Amino acid sequence: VIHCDAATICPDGTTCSLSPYGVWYCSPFS
């Protein structure tokens, strides 16, 4: 899994990103 912050994690084929509600997660890029 990928990382960028410190707690939240990221699956495969995605990029760490922050939600508009302050939610840390990974989005599918292409």
Curated annotation (Swiss-Prot):
Granulins are disulfide bridged. One of its GO terms (cellular component) is extracellular space. It comes from the Eukaryota. Keywords: Cytokine, Disulfide bond, Secreted. Disulfide bonds join 4-16, 10-26. GO terms for molecular function: cytokine activity. Ubiquitous. It is found in: Secreted. Its main location: secreted. Belongs to the granulin family. Granulins have possible cytokine-like activity. They may play a role in inflammation, wound repair, and tissue remodeling. This is Granulin-1.
